[PDB]
Amino acid sequence: EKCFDHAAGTSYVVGETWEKPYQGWMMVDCTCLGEGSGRITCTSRNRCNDQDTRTSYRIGDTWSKKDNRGNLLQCICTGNGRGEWKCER
């Protein structure tokens, strides 16, 4: 029983996970459920998809960007089970 990633031309068995692009630059992790419909479930809970930089980060990745007043922030992806990161002056 397979799930298919038609964008990547690939297929998976029940229980397998893989990385898949979402709307151009974001990344999600998808798991094959199958259920006789090739059902997959995807989530970015373990990634940081920062709309501000249109870049997808992994837990532990660090990056910098401005706040709204000229200060450079340093950010780190923590995940926290919810796609979370922290930035600090």
Partner: peptide
């Protein structure tokens, strides 16, 4: 340093054939 927390979470399902 002052801290700002953010998150972005995408969750969906779909079928495939």
């Amino acid at each position: 340093g002052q801290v700002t927390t953010e998150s972005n979470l995408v969750e969906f399902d779909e079928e495939s054939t």
